[PDB]
Design an enzyme around this catalytic site. Structure first.
Site, PDB file in Angstrom:
ATOM      1  N   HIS A  40      28.351  55.231  30.853  1.00  0.00           N
ATOM      2  CA  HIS A  40      28.545  55.701  29.484  1.00  0.00           C
ATOM      3  C   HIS A  40      27.272  55.605  28.654  1.00  0.00           C
ATOM      4  O   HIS A  40      27.247  56.120  27.528  1.00  0.00           O
ATOM      5  CB  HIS A  40      29.737  54.971  28.834  1.00  0.00           C
ATOM      6  CG  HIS A  40      29.427  53.642  28.221  1.00  0.00           C
ATOM      7  ND1 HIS A  40      29.733  52.449  28.838  1.00  0.00           N
ATOM      8  CD2 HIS A  40      28.922  53.319  27.003  1.00  0.00           C
ATOM      9  CE1 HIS A  40      29.392  51.444  28.046  1.00  0.00           C
ATOM     10  NE2 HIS A  40      28.912  51.947  26.918  1.00  0.00           N
ATOM     11  N   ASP A  84      32.233  52.819  35.673  1.00  0.00           N
ATOM     12  CA  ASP A  84      31.216  52.893  34.620  1.00  0.00           C
ATOM     13  C   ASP A  84      29.910  52.304  35.143  1.00  0.00           C
ATOM     14  O   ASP A  84      29.521  51.174  34.837  1.00  0.00           O
ATOM     15  CB  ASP A  84      31.698  52.176  33.365  1.00  0.00           C
ATOM     16  CG  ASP A  84      30.809  52.434  32.167  1.00  0.00           C
ATOM     17  OD1 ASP A  84      29.949  53.337  32.230  1.00  0.00           O
ATOM     18  OD2 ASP A  84      30.965  51.734  31.150  1.00  0.00           O
ATOM     19  N   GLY A 175      25.660  47.896  21.982  1.00  0.00           N
ATOM     20  CA  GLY A 175      24.250  47.756  22.222  1.00  0.00           C
ATOM     21  C   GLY A 175      23.903  46.878  23.402  1.00  0.00           C
ATOM     22  O   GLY A 175      22.770  46.935  23.887  1.00  0.00           O
ATOM     23  N   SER A 177      25.763  47.262  26.085  1.00  0.00           N
ATOM     24  CA  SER A 177      26.297  48.090  27.159  1.00  0.00           C
ATOM     25  C   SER A 177      25.238  48.407  28.198  1.00  0.00           C
ATOM     26  O   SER A 177      24.079  48.670  27.869  1.00  0.00           O
ATOM     27  CB  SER A 177      26.836  49.394  26.583  1.00  0.00           C
ATOM     28  OG  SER A 177      28.043  49.144  25.901  1.00  0.00           O
ATOM     29  N   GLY A 178      25.650  48.388  29.464  1.00  0.00           N
ATOM     30  CA  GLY A 178      24.758  48.660  30.561  1.00  0.00           C
ATOM     31  C   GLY A 178      24.035  47.441  31.087  1.00  0.00           C
ATOM     32  O   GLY A 178      23.472  47.497  32.186  1.00  0.00           O
TER      33      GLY A 178
END
Ligand SMILES: [Ca+2]
Length: 223
Positions: A40, A84, A175, A177-178
């Site tokens: 995402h 994801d 923020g 994320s990942g």
């Protein structure tokens, strides 16, 4: 990261910032030319920033390398956030040292109760917004699948796990994320989603990396 602590410069050497004119997601360096992040977080024109602490100041250990190719998981579903995960190939290999280093992929899945390290430059508030310039860290346990599914009825697949605190107050956030979830020196999770941040009975949900090691290895071997 809500309720965490300042990591310290370059103490999380596999942590990367994805930059498209600004920081927008984290990622993890898994070898000298490949980064793993969340699907995402996909966009075109990514610069990968390694060796960062303060993302607004050049401090001397940074490496800025543009992406040459991005590969979103073939079964990523943006509505449910199942699968994801995304791979990013760097245009040139990073120079590995004590402050820029890869993180190992797991050979087995981690069990509930394992303590992990979560890190990122995301929001530090559960109600307001305050984005830090330096990297923040959080130690948090993996929660049982039963408590995860009880917190998010009908939403948790076999490719997800929960980590954090059912009491609230400590969580990853927008923020982050990942970014990485590292347990016993292995990358076990990717910061993926949650309802709000640090809310009671709403822990963070993470991509379960151990389900993807075969896909990661075969993709790197052919690209
Ligand atoms: Ca910097």
């Amino acid at each position: 990261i809500v309720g965490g602590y300042t990591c310290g410069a370059n103490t999380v050497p596999y942590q990367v910032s994805l930059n498209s004119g600004y920081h927008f997601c984290g990622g993890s360096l898994i070898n000298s030319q490949w980064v793993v992040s969340a699907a995402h977080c996909y966009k075109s024109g990514i610069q990968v920033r390694l060796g960062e602490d303060n993302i607004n100041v050049v401090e001397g250990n940074e490496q800025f390398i543009s992406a040459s190719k991005s590969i979103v998981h073939p079964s990523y579903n943006s509505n449910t956030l199942n699968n994801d995960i995304m791979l990013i190939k760097l245009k040139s290999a990073a120079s590995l040292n004590s402050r820029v280093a890869s993180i190992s992929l797991p050979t087995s899945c981690a069990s509930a109760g394992t303590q992990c390290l979560i890190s990122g430059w995301g929001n530090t508030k559960s109600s307001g917004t305050s984005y830090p310039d330096v990297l923040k860290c959080l130690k948090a346990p993996i929660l049982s699948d039963s408590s995860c599914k009880s917190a998010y009825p009908g939403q948790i697949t076999s490719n997800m796990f929960c980590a954090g605190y059912l009491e609230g107050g400590k969580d990853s956030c927008q923020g982050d994320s990942g970014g990485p979830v590292v347990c016993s020196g292995k990358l076990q999770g990717i910061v993926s989603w949650g309802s709000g941040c640090a809310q009671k009975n709403k822990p963070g949900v993470y991509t379960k990396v151990c389900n993807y090691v075969s896909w990661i290895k075969q993709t790197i071997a052919s690209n």
